[PDB]
């Protein structure tokens with residue numbers, strides 16, 4: 656694209672793969688009730704799969720772990736499949752054509768229901784989650800709410816864009832981004848799933864797309880991408896603490912990024 660700055664996000668360990676929730680380590684680190692945190696994480700993981708299994712063809716695409724939604728865009732005989740019954744087909748060159756049908760359908764539901772999730776999963780299944788969010792953000796001090804301020808401050812920039820790089824399979828990552836509210840700030844074409852190939856392959860897959868005329872900045876938590884972002888001359892912005900986000904937003908408000 657014509658974007659000048661690219662912000663790569665690694666929201667695992669905090670948002671996408673919040674494995675600190677189920678392990679109970681989050682409650683130990685931050686002095687919260689362990690049992691309450693585990694219950695909220697297990698319910699979230701259910702609401703996600705109940706959304707993915709009933710709308711994004713999870714059970715079909717569990718092993719067919721692609722890396723980008725447009726990865727198999729070559730084999731799609733582009734046709735109006737509004738009547739195509741996915742439950743009654745030879746699914747279990749002719750298979751890749753059937754496989755691409757689902758990814759285009761996944762994209763259609765994504766781009767349609769990212770600001771209307773009650774239309775995808777009917778209400779009150781959205782009201783149940785909005786209740787689930789506040790119950791968790793009361794433990795994380797509105798971490799997802801805080802991170803969206805930095806995401807919208809970048810999405811609102813015409814020269815800047817933000818992309819997502821997680822290690823989950825693409826479909827669950829799309830389900831989490833859809834529910835959690837990150838759909839407005841992460842375009843579906845800017846979400847990469849480093850499941851089988853590692854984050855380095857995804858980082859290299861990005862720079863070939865946005866070119867050498869762009870300024871790449873990596874925002875994440877951990878060290879797995881620390882060397883992965885250093886070996887590609889991408890400045891790493893740690894994001895562990897809460898003040899790290901206020902400073903990040905501060906550094907964004909003053910055009911330092």
Ligand SMILES: O=C(N/N=C/c1ccc(Sc2ccccn2)o1)c1cccc(F)c1
Pocket residue numbers: 668669670671673685788791792794795796797798799800835895896897
């Ligand atoms: O909020 C979400 N995560 N937060 C994570 C995380 C880790 C560390 C911190 S900072 C902090 C400050 C004080 C007390 C506790 N934490 O936040 C979340 C994630 C996914 C879905 C959702 F709906 C919500």
